[PDB]
């Protein structure tokens, strides 16, 4: 009953920077938690009261923010290629079916 979709990655040159979109419809009053996972290892996430977690990887260079209701954003900085990865947008919720996933979004970094 939530359904995440994803957009914002693509090809980029190392240094380079993306900013990756996650859009939540459904049931959004149940969700405790919006992050970014590597295809899943957290890199960086936001709750409900605003906090947010970083992976060491990507405290000061990634920042995640949400815009809206609906809409939560990573934007990366300082790319490098071993951050080539898929990323999944994932949504913590309240009850039986507790976490749902965005579709993936590829990024690659080249040299």
């Known amino acids: 009953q939530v359904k995440l979709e994803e957009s914002g990655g693509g090809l980029v040159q190392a240094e380079g920077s993306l900013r990756l979109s996650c859009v939540t419809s459904?049931?959004?009053?149940?969700?405790?938690?919006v992050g970014w996972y590597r295809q899943r290892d957290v890199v960086a996430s936001?709750?409900?009261?605003?906090?947010t977690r970083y992976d060491g990887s990507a405290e000061g260079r990634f920042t995640i923010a949400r815009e809206n209701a609906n809409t939560v954003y990573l934007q990366m900085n300082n790319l490098r290629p071993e951050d080539s990865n898929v990323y999944v947008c994932?949504?913590?919720?309240?009850?039986?079916?507790?976490?749902?996933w965005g579709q993936g979004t590829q990024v690659t970094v080249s040299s």
């Open positions: 459904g049931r959004i009053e149940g969700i405790l938690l």
């Open positions: 994932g949504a913590l919720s309240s009850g039986v079916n507790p976490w749902a």
């Open positions: 936001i709750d409900r009261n605003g906090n």
